[PDB]
Amino acid sequence: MQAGQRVVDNPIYLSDMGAALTGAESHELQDVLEETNIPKRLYKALSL
Amino acid sequence: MQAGQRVVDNPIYLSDMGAALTGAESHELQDVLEETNIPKRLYKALSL
Amino acid sequence: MVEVENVVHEDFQVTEEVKALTAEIVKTIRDIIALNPLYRESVLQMMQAGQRVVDNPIYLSDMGAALTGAESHELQDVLEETNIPKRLYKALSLLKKEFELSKLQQRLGREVEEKIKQTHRKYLLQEQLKIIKKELGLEKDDK
Amino acid sequence: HLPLIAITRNPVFPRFIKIIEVKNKKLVELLRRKVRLAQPYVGVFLKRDDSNESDVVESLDEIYHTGTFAQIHEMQDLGDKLRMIVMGHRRVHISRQL
């Protein structure tokens, strides 16, 4: 799933799959899912 | 796709595929397209 | 030093069937880079004749003729030619001229190696014959 | 009532599978506007002498009167962002393409 094929009709799902590789504790995962805005969860993911 | 199988139910399509091998410029093909009668295009194709 | 861009490049208005010789030039280049790989073959995939990105055909013909190993003099000779089919004819001639030598070297290598194989394979057969004939009987029971 | 497609040195003989990879990125906008439609399709024409990208969009007589409608197979976009597949399926001579 690369970014140059433009076949990622739902980017949010690919970003979630990429965030799945993170080793953060389960609590962190729940907290990141609770976030509603898109840049908030993305920034939290980047900081984590 | 052989002629001995009698599976060429639409000969015009096979003839067009065979006429595509000719190296005449595209314009010439358009000139061949102007022809409505079948022997006219067949004779022009043979000449080509 | 005085210079002027006297780059003559006449070409027929009808440009449909005029690129077919180019098609043969790229087919010979594909056969030269497939049978005699010099450079990577990805560059041939980058610059194709079907993309309609060949804004400068003279440059494309020169880049295709550059893979030939013909001496520099020949390149100068191709530049001396003014007509477009003459240079295309010369570029193809350069390609075929290299191609014959390449094919000779390749055939010779596979042939010579197969001769080595027929050498050692017959020696393997002779070794099997000995081993199978040596261990049949009691072998040195004269005394 | 769609803009003409930019063949860009790609002859599409009738009943002869062909691929089109235009360098311009404006035709992909037309490719994304047709995805919500139920049936996916594209039309095919041929360009006349002296190809010119400004003439394909400026006048509509340049293109020859014959045309070939066909159905889309599948998009790939391996290298470029405009990798459409074309086919010569249904030949047609539109009464007036303009």
From Swiss-Prot, chain D:
Localization of this protein: Mitochondrion matrix
Tissue: Duodenum, heart, lung and liver, but not thymus.
Record's disease association: CODAS syndrome: A rare syndrome characterized by the combination of cerebral, ocular, dental, auricular, and skeletal features. These include developmental delay, craniofacial anomalies, cataracts, ptosis, median nasal groove, delayed tooth eruption, hearing loss, short stature, delayed epiphyseal ossification, metaphyseal hip dysplasia, and vertebral coronal clefts.
Summary of the function given for this chain in its UniProt record: ATP-dependent serine protease that mediates the selective degradation of misfolded, unassembled or oxidatively damaged polypeptides as well as certain short-lived regulatory proteins in the mitochondrial matrix. Endogenous substrates include mitochondrial steroidogenic acute regulatory (StAR) protein, DELE1, helicase Twinkle (TWNK) and the large ribosomal subunit protein MRPL32/bL32m. MRPL32/bL32m is protected from degradation by LONP1 when it is bound to a nucleic acid (RNA), but TWNK is not. May also have a chaperone function in the assembly of inner membrane protein complexes.
Quaternary structure and partners: Homohexamer. Organized in a ring with a central cavity. The ATP-binding and proteolytic domains (AP-domain) form a hexameric chamber, while the N-terminal domain is arranged as a trimer of dimers. DNA and RNA binding is stimulated by substrate and inhibited by ATP binding. Interacts with TWNK and mitochondrial DNA polymerase subunit POLG.
Family label: Belongs to the peptidase S16 family.
Domain notes: The Lon N-terminal domains are crucial for the overall structure of the protein, maintaining it in a conformation allowing its proper functioning.
The name this protein goes by in its record: Lon protease homolog, mitochondrial
Native source species: Homo sapiens (Human)
Residues of the full protein shown: 123 to 220 of 959
